[PDB]
Amino acid sequence: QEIVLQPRSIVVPGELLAEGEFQIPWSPYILKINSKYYSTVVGLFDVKDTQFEVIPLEGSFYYPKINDIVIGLVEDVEIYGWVVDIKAPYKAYLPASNLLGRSINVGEDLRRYLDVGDYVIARIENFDRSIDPVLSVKGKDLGRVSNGIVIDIMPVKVPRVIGKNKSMYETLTSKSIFVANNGRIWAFSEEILIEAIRKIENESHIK
Amino acid sequence: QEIVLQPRSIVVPGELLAEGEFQIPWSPYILKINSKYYSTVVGLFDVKDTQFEVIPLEGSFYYPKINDIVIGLVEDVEIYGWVVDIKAPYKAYLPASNLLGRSINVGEDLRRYLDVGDYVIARIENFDRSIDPVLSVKGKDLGRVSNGIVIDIMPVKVPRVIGKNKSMYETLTSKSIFVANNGRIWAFSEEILIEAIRKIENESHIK
Amino acid sequence: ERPKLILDDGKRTDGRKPDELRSIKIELGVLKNADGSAIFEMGNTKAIAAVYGPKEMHPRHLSLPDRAVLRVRYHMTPFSTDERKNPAPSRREIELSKVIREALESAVLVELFPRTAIDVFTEILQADAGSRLVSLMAASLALADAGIPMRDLIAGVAVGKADGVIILDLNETEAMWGEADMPIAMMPSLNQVTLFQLNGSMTPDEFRQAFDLAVKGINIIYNLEREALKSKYV
Amino acid sequence: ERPKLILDDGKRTDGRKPDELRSIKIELGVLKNADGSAIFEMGNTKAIAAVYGPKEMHPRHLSLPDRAVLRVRYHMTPFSTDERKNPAPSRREIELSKVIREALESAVLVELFPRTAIDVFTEILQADAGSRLVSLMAASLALADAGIPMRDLIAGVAVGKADGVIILDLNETEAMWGEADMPIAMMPSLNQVTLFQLNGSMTPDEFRQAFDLAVKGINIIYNLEREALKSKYV
Amino acid sequence: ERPKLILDDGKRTDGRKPDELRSIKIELGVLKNADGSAIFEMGNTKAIAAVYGPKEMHPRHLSLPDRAVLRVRYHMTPFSTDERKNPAPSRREIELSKVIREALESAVLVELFPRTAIDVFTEILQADAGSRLVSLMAASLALADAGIPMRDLIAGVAVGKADGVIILDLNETEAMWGEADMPIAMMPSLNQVTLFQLNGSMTPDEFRQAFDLAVKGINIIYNLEREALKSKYV
Amino acid sequence: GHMSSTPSNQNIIPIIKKESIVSLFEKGIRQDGRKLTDYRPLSITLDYAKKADGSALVKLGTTMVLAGTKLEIDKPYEDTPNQGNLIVNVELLPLAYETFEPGPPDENAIELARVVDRSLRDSKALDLTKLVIEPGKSVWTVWLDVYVLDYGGNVLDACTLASVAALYNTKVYKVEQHISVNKNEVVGKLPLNYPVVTISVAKVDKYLVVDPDLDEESIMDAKISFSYTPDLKIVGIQKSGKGSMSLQDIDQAENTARSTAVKLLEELKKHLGI
Amino acid sequence: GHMSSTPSNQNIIPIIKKESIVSLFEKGIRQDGRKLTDYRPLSITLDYAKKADGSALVKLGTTMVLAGTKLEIDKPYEDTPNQGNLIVNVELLPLAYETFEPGPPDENAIELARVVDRSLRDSKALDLTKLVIEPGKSVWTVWLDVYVLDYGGNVLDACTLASVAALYNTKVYKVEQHISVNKNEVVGKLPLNYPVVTISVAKVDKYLVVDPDLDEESIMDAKISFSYTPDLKIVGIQKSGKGSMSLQDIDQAENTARSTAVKLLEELKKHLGI
Amino acid sequence: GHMSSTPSNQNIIPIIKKESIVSLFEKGIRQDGRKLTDYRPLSITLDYAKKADGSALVKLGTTMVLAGTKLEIDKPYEDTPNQGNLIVNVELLPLAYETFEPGPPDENAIELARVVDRSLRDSKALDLTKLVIEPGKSVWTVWLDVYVLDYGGNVLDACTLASVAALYNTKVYKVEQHISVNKNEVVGKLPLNYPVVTISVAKVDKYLVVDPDLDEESIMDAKISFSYTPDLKIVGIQKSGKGSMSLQDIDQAENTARSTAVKLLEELKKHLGI
Numbered sequence A, B: 001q002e003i004v005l006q007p008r009s010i011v012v013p014g015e016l017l018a019e020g021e022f023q024i025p026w027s028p029y030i031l032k033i034n035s036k037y038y039s040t041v042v043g044l045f046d047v048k049d050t051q052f053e054v055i056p057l058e059g060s061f062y063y064p065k066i067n068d069i070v071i072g073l074v075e076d077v078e079i080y081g082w083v084v085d086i087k088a089p090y091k092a093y094l095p096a097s098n099l100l101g102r103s104i105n106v107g108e109d110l111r112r113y114l115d116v117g118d119y120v121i122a123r124i125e126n127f128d129r130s131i132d133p134v135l136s137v138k139g140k141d142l143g144r145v146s147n148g149i150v151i152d153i154m155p156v157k158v159p160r161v162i163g164k165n166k167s168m169y170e171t172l173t174s175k176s177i178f179v180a181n182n183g184r185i186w187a188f189s190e191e192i193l194i195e196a197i198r199k200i201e202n203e204s205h206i207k
Numbered sequence C, D, E: 001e002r003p004k005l006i007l008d009d010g011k012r013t014d015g016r017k018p019d020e021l022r023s024i025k026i027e028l029g030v031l032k033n034a035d036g037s038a039i040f041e042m043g044n045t046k047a048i049a050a051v052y053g054p055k056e057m058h059p060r061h062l063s064l065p066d067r068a069v070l071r072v073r074y075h076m077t078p079f080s081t082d083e084r085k086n087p088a089p090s091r092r093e094i095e096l097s098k099v100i101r102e103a104l105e106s107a108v109l110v111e112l113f114p115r116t117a118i119d120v121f122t123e124i125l126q127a128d129a130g131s132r133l134v135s136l137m138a139a140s141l142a143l144a145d146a147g148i149p150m151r152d153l154i155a156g157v158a159v160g161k162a163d164g165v166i167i168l169d170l171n172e173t174e175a176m177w178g179e180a181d182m183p184i185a186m187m188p189s190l191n192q193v194t195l196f197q198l199n200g201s202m203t204p205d206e207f208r209q210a211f212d213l214a215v216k217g218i219n220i221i222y223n224l225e226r227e228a229l230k231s232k233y234v
Numbered sequence F, G, H: 001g002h003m004s005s006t007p008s009n010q011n012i013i014p015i016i017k018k019e020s021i022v023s024l025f026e027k028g029i030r031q032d033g034r035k036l037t038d039y040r041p042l043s044i045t046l047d048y049a050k051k052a053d054g055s056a057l058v059k060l061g062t063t064m065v066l067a068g069t070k071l072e073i074d075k076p077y078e079d080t081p082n083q084g085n086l087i088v089n090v091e092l093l094p095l096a097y098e099t100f101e102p103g104p105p106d107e108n109a110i111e112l113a114r115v116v117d118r119s120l121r122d123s124k125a126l127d128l129t130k131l132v133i134e135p136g137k138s139v140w141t142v143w144l145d146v147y148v149l150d151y152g153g154n155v156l157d158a159c160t161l162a163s164v165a166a167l168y169n170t171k172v173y174k175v176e177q178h179i180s181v182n183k184n185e186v187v188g189k190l191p192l193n194y195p196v197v198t199i200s201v202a203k204v205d206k207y208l209v210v211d212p213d214l215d216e217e218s219i220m221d222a223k224i225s226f227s228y229t230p231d232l233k234i235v236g237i238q239k240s241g242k243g244s245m246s247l248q249d250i251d252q253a254e255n256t257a258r259s260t261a262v263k264l265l266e267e268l269k270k271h272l273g274i
């Protein structure tokens, strides 16, 4: 057979989603055991076309994907680069050569480039299960942040904050915000958008 | 003077072998103290021509020699190479560049090349008292093992298993086997050669 | 031995029937710092758990190339027991931390996070029997609250024998004075046992009767665990 | 002091003459996992030793660039002594582990294996005096059994004084009640002393008499060690 | 409570007036190995300190990228007190080591030496009250003797209340039997407090009276510290 | 042997966040809208730990502390035949914060226990002479164990509140002479003279802030804590942290702490039913 | 403070070796030619440790365990005036396996001691009321110390055998009233009701194997141990290892263990002279 | 569980420096101009630690050791009802040398304590039967704590000197029967039969050197220490260090040590006032 057990339901680890042999791409949120598919997380069952997925409702960590745009926080400065925190299980590394467009020089490195406590907007240039993520500043409007508020959120919530065709992204800009894959948003006076972007976390499952 | 104290004898640490000034190449199994030579191991005193040696009868470890052919076991996979166990005091490293004939690529390294628990046949391309041994897969019939039994033995016994003009190697092949320097042998149906290649360990000193 | 454990009405000292569970209460998201958290109460036994993780592990040589490492602590507060417990870990706590970790190892999908640690800390706030299971189930729930992928939740209960009667979900009087106490935990949807211990003595037929009764309790508990996890979204 | 240690026949409490050794028994290759192993018995004193090594050492900063590091443990089992010994290492065990390591440092050719550790573990199964020496000689034999190159084997014995008589290879009664106890170990073919301690009191002439008697015992023991090691090949 | 602390002459048990310090003696460069060292005596309270540093720190992950790490030990010898003190660190010693380190953190210019440790070890040789301050001032002096740059020296004294009288620099009788004991240390040229604790009880007005009296003592001590450091060059 | 080392920052906060935290201090308010002199919301749940002789769960903002007591009969110490005993232990549970590891109490938990113990003792709130059963022969030992379950800033003041509440909540059981404790009969509550509070003031540049949260603790120069009884005697003081403060800062801090203490004591008394 | 962590593999075995180990399981036999239900060769040498009150050296395949007892006179615990004491310690000596380091008992040795202790206690084999010398005043304490000298797989079952054998081998000495122990006069042997055995069953894919060796332990999914007295009551159960098993696996395992127990008890009795 | 490991060199000295150190040994003198048989300058300051019952600060060259005693009343051990107690502790303070870290005594400090303890005990210098107050009921316990403040070489001999001097310096206080110690009344000094000395001889190639300094210890092959009473009985011997020595070296060393002992005992007696 090939059958699905649920509509748009709230899902829990171990919950049977479907029986049959579907041709689903592998996901960390679904566990296939022979002809049965189970959720591995607290989440929202989502059927699209003939395939299905589980959307996680829970989780504080970001899983690196190559070429993701990410806003990190510098923590350590090594000899030839900067260690960066991107709210992942693994910490990211921004090479000096990447920032400079050239090799470090014989007595280089104050920190006018980047010091501890600086926010950086950056893209993941390398990552797999065998190595920590590598950052690149190359693109436009990447690099250090100077001004603005940076709001932290569940990376799990990032797709709701942007929304269908960036609809949620629109209805925030015009109210008074860059949304990274990282669960962090870089952002008028007395802009208390934060109080609303926390309310999206607390109601994403609703309507 | 220049005299030898023993014929083909079983030898023990501290045992005086010879008095005089012989022109012997240095060996870990013989200790020269001015005009006296002593065994450092449980072994078999062997006189050849005008020189002498001690053949060790004891010892579970292999001492790397450059260009030795060796069958190791992969244990760790680092970013740009594989850590390998060759029954030595030091663990060996097989560089990725050596295996690939080219540099690692930006998202490379599953393990279809080599994973933990794989046996590898390989040669030692670099080693000295200052560094751990480096492996090379370059040669023919090196690289990963797919099939067959791999039998572990005292590296000390490797020269007896091959034998004079590979005589012991012959009398095994025809009975029903690659013999590495490592004290490991890669190898018809229900071939219980192992039960015989253990008997060589238990009688090498005899006849 | 000393008190009567089965009364002439055939009921237990706390009024329960042999096949009846103590009341259960579950709270989730109880701690702000923890990546996930839970309080589990089964009768007067109460545990809190906190989870932190996937995160890189500093002693790299203690990490694993293909898996996350689970790091687990079962600890009882000094005031959780009838007589004060010394806060230094006991041999009991050391054993139970291992048995609880190995139960969780079967459930947590650790190979998703190579070279990381997932930290699981549990504290017994009130001990009235069954605290290893209440700890384990709080940990399971806390891991779900943390969004850490697992094959299944873990539900567990202790069965045993009291004055010759096979009984479900022991209280402290029964654990202390009864003839046998057998904690069992499972991944119920997968039909898999994750924790299994017996202390005391049972015949082989009594053991099979007890195992069967445990499964019935586990299935009830599992549904409460599922509902608790869903409750905030519905 | 309390019992007579030298009887009117001029013999000792166990029937030995002042210049007589206790009986010796040596077994080699006693353990399967250990790279080398040995049991040494001298009278009712019995030690087992196990060796593991040359192997790379994980705390690289604890390794040595030009030498192997020896790691050595002398430990007594709780039931080795007349009254139970607490299994936690004592100050005595800590001292003796060091004295035994430093003896072995003179013999083992550690510069053959830079950046490695050679691990040497010994356990006293029965203690009736002389256990530091029986430990040291079991370790020496176990290292030979492991094929780890050494300058020489180590043989040792304790000499002492009992009721004014200089005596060879003390038993526990003599160690406890005698006037002096002096353990000495050597690499006998190299004429070198590796361990040397005295407790109690002796005149300088008594000390020289005792040292001389120890050498005679050591030479006997050394030959037994050589024969034991050769015995399986001949 | 038990002995009279203020006598009918209005003087204290050791003959001092309420606003009078105990006698002070300072010696510098007392140890050969230490990079810097000092002995400080205030009455019968005596501490020795030794400093080693800037040096690279082996557990690199314990180092700081922008600062040196201070490593500090306050310890009392077993024979420093009226009744023997057990040499194992006590909870008191653990607390005082932290309070002393944090005082020194304000003074030492640690950002001059990224990724290093500066080690500060102090030992109380005689304890007659005020030993945390005598320790802290010996450490300050020892750091100066070691040539380790600091913003200022640290001077300190304990004020308190005895039989209702606010008093400067307590002795042990007053510390034990008085109503309050308040150690204060400062960088006096910078007007900055580095250590501040009170035990016992005071009214808010008494607290202000006492703080004021402490400053007067500190200023006297500071000048003695300056003169001691200069004395060998002049 | 032991030693105290400078720690790593376990909450490195970005320059930009510091500016926000202090942005409304000019107007006398913080992040959460509270005044510079306000505590966060406080709840105190008595008898939370049912097998404790007394207990209290304190929630102060996101800080959570569970205190519990257990009483035992002991022979008194030889030097104090006419007093019972109080033993204070604090643990900073690895549940409480991400960088906490399990192990015995570190220097921070030891400091907490010792500051709380002194404040209780020197306040005279718990008169240990009241804990005697038979002079010279049998006294009560009060074990106070204080567990920080959620580290959200100002854990000291929450530990003091929880400790005082647990002690107030402590049941005393009948003692039977044959001597045994009969736990079926509650004859008393632990006798206290009054509550005590500890008030922590953090210095953040030119401002002093009462009841610092996690973020404020991450940016403060130093902190100082002052303990009060209801008569507003000062019954303990502890400066903590790496930075120094002026004599004038300390003076101002005490004046500010004492004003807050009056209100906190009042709220604690409501929670206690006294 | 303490915590349990996933270990590294201390015996990483190559894919190829796993296939060989299980290659003859279809025919009901293993590497060494033994049946899936057979123990390895067992020898038990009593009185091996001559200064122990009782002792036994157990060799089970390449696993070697030395157990020894020492008895002491103690006042009984206040709650158990009519019982003596049993204290079980197991050490996994660094002699025993290459990756073992010296230190106090790790969680594996602690688990072993506690599983053995329970099986001895709950079996009722050693009735501690028999260890009383003077009720309320003097009892025997039995210290049982169990040393794993060679770690060759299934150390639990060897530890149980050695423990039971050492206890059976324990001499009881005359007690002289003045109270002293006179070690020149053996008046008794420690009184046991019967022996106990522990039987460990490892799950290796679709097979269950009794008495796993080192290689089998290195590839097993999980293991479960069942303790028996001669009446075949179950007197302890412990699932160990990282993997799960089904209810049906456990059921089958118990049935298989119990069949083996009968034979093992018989062999142990021959070794004991009972 | 514990083990002894080869240490790293904590004083790696350059080839060139070794040649200089030994350059004048042919002429019978060292770096500092002292003869191969001479101790460095010795000062002994009694009653240095004023709250100790007895104490001595020993400076031997750049080595500095502070020993102190404290006496307590104890019930004697059951096996020794007619003797008091001596407990020796040595600590190698992290103040003393750059590579010393704080922690409990390592194997070097444990060895020092045990060598000193034996020499004191086996010398019969301190007759513990003299420390009895009431036979079977009350005896003195002498706690001897010996702190190495500056590690400058030959710390053993300085520890022995300091230990003997502190014991000689020990005040005995009046015991009041009700039993209490009245510290207002000194009735005695600890009773010693005689002093003891320890003499350390280092082997540096073909030379033997008395009282090795830091540099000499850094290049020596091995060292051996011999303890003497004034009758020149040998009352302890300890070979220490990684290297071996011949029977003849040991013989020569003892003869050389004993010659030095006579002079050292004489100097120590002047320092003690006996």
Ligand SMILES: [Cl-]
Residues within 6 Å of the ligand: C129, C130, C131, C132, C133
């Ligand atoms: Cl439980």
Ligand SMILES: [Cl-]
Residues within 6 Å of the ligand: D129, D130, D131, D132, D133
């Ligand atoms: Cl010995």
Ligand SMILES: [Cl-]
Residues within 6 Å of the ligand: E129, E130, E131, E132, E133
């Ligand atoms: Cl102080």
